[PDB]
């Protein structure tokens, strides 16, 4: 994936008024650069190897370019085989609007829910194409929108096992697992609510809580396919800790790309107000 | 050249603000934060002959404190800083201006949206209890007609809703309310009677700690609010 | 064996089915895809816990077998199970829109659905056995079939009817169970001697060059045909007891979705093409080694040659892929490209067939060849960076096969 | 609460014994060691309006020392601790009494086998020389016919026979012999003179330093002997 931007600035970015013109120019540059250069860079290797003829040759399969007139990065590089690009033309299949080619990140990883998957892919598009303030605004918008989202999807799926080992008279014991801790808190809260108890081997959605809740613990867990009891649903919802979950499900990735793209994911310094 | 003890104190405060320092010719000292969040400027009685960039201002001040107050500091023949005392001569190499964040001009402060007064003891109490109460944010706002400052722990509550330590600044007679947020790792004032000048239009907004010896300017995190 | 143990080499093919098929036909063969019976299967089992294919403890209540030449969706339903008896499926009700109580099965599908209910498991399983007998599939596929379908059906017929009826699946009465699936050693595969099991999940996984977050049938079906199914509620385990109607209709669209994918990809046409181009049994498509052995043997036999005995070597892993080092930096203008058939092209660069080795030469540091500072390893004989040396005028048999296949691909693109 | 500087110093010295505290509503302060090896009591003049549990004492006292002594301390609306200065307030969190380990019942000392008295400079000498001389245990005994102290190095001398510090505590008119063994770290007390109440029975024994402001009680390890 050779990175060639010098030719663009060398020719003069002002010459190009549309993304299509830049794409066409760099396509002609690739056409004039590939065949002679690759032929000369392989004929010496062919005579070194002493074969009948060098079949070995590349092409100009893929291109990528940040949209013209915008301040997006275009393409960054988070880790080995973990990156994103804004491809305009795959193997002479031109796209009227650029298509994002993404891999490595959690956009395709099913450990996180699907809503945050859409949110990550949209954020990736924004950073690649739009620019900084767009990502800041989208951050703030989603951050506002995440709090009132339904508690079912934003609850972590866990497996409830060997509960009796980690309980101490209905209270957390030694090395109580986080999901098991939430199950114990649920059992304490639903003590006298007439609900079916959580069974070993069942699946539970876990909603963590902030320190100091009346339940006296940092998490709760409720059985698979069911809802929180109406009596304690409001008390839980008013006391849930979505902050650390949001960061784990959405903030984590931006940190990597922005640190690897010369980008910031939230700003709290001026640099403007002064000189 | 010759520097007074108060001048060296201002240089040490600027070193706390930023490791490096620009010393242009004149009677003014100026240095901005590495990230540019804070800016410290002051006017000194002494004059300066030549501009110089110092990477290690604190170490240079430590060296300077060991010699007479009347030692002369000038440009050495080897491209460095020469300090001549009555009996001793010190060679401190001069740092490159490009390797240290360099200010250009002091900011002509516009009309302040709010004017407030703070005393030395109250500010010292604020900064001292900030470490003990692990406070990282302070919100300056209006509560029952009183312009006040309040402490907020950002880490445990990003919503900035947990009051931990509130200090009342003074009276505020106006319906133009505001909540301006400061990060504790920015302001580094010297003790003294200081005045706050707060300016804001839309997203734009900054604060100014003006004092008898030096004046500093600090930024506002975007979640600051203001209706004027 | 006897010429092996005296320390002498025997040339030709140890395998004999390939020899028989190559000798019997010889010339290139033609075929009509319509004549070969391609069967599709899918099964739904209601269970308290995840139905485990290896143990097969739960009961089968849903079997949809799609026959190609008869072009029929045979549906086997179990009415009176141990999970409470249920009503009988209705075609016209299912064809209707879901709001009145239907399941939105396309009408042409119900035009071919041959539905049969059964009061007890033994009768339904025996009917499935005799349906297999009357219309023996020639290639028996489905989505994730060797993982959940084939094992479950065969374990259940063994645990209910006995091995004497379990072995009735094959036309030659031989159903041998292979145990390994050495990747994690988790599951077991089955082999019915006479029908070529070909898991459609593996066919898609290997012959698509596509990556998806999940390879479950639903997501890939949505990707391919843009046709999901109506959302449902509750765990699947209780569906049979809530609205069993939808249950059966659910499975009926399940088998079709796969057929839809076939109609978009033509995968079974591909498997027929490869099998009849390599003159080899169907299941060998799963293994590239068998395919290549078959084609190279057929070509060499056409050239009046003999293949050597399969030499026994130990496993010596070699260094993997040269992965470049990425600097975590944003690159705005980045032109990316990869050459075509890198390894196949190199195969003609060094002509590496077993007879083409010609010795070794003086080995320089690899960086010397990277910078080109090393001199010419040989002038009249070809050079490779591994210190080894190969002929230039004697074309290898492997390069000849590469040339033939590449010419065929170019001709067929034309 | 309006507290005096002397009370702050006394309860600072108390904080060494236990990190937390349970200031019950009343007039009497009382702490026990976390391992239950040393108890400390005192009576003050500032009445306690409500019970409060404090986890980190040292930070709380650091905050207290940086405000006016007339700042009124009470319980906030959320059950926390609100201390209001003349023009400021501080919200120190209040812990649950369950998590903070505190002694349950006020402790009386029944009777001493031989009541003695120790002068301030004696304990001061002992405490400054314990760290320098690498001493890990001490013994109060009768030698020559008088009650004396003896410093021992258990680390090297497992027999605790190598005396390093000796000082005749006083006279001894009796027939009971004793060798009470205590670790200097176990005994933490304010600089000052004290009255020793020393009692014993079977395997179990007591030493007590009664003071003019606060009283301490330390235990005696199993190596202690007492013949009556």
Author numbering:
A (entry chain C): 623 to 897
B (entry chain B), D (entry chain D): 1 to 228
C (entry chain C): 71 to 484
Give the published text.
In state 2, both thumb domains align at equivalent heights. DNA interaction is restricted to the left polymerase, where thumb residues Arg-704, Phe-796, Lys-797, and Arg-803 engage the substrate, while the right polymerase maintains no DNA contacts. The primer 3′-end occupies neither catalytic site of the left polymerase. In state 2, the DNA occupies the central region of the clamp channel, maintaining proximity to all three Arg-131 residues from each clamp monomer. In both states 1 and 2, the DNA substrate remains displaced from the polymerization active site in either polymerase, with the primer 3′ terminus positioned 16 Å away from the catalytic residue Asp-620 and the finger domain maintaining an open conformation. During the transition from state 3 to state 2, the duplex region of the DNA moves toward the clamp’s central channel and becomes less severely tilted. This shift causes the primer/template DNA to disengage from the left polymerase and move 14 Å toward the right polymerase. Superposition of the right polymerases of states 2 and 3 illuminates the structural rearrangements required to reposition the DNA primer from its inactive placement in the left polymerase of state 2 to the catalytically competent configuration observed in state 3. This alignment reveals four coordinated transitions: (i) further upward tilting of the sliding clamp relative to the DNA; (ii) downward compression of the polymerase thumb for improved DNA engagement; consequently, (iii) P/T DNA rotation that shifts the template strand laterally by 16 Å to optimize interactions with the thumb; and (iv) finger domain closure to stabilize the incoming nucleotide.
The T4 replication system centers on a holoenzyme complex that is assembled from the DNA polymerase (gp43) and the sliding clamp (gp45) loaded onto a primer/template junction by the clamp loader complex (gp44/62) in the presence of ATP. The sliding clamp plays a crucial role by encircling the DNA double helix and anchoring the polymerase to the template. Sequence analysis reveals that T4 polymerase contains three main structural regions: an N-terminal domain, a 3′-5′ exonuclease domain responsible for proofreading activity, and a C-terminal polymerase domain. The T4 gp45 sliding clamp forms a trimeric ring structure, with each of the three monomers composed of structurally similar N-terminal and C-terminal domains (NTD and CTD).
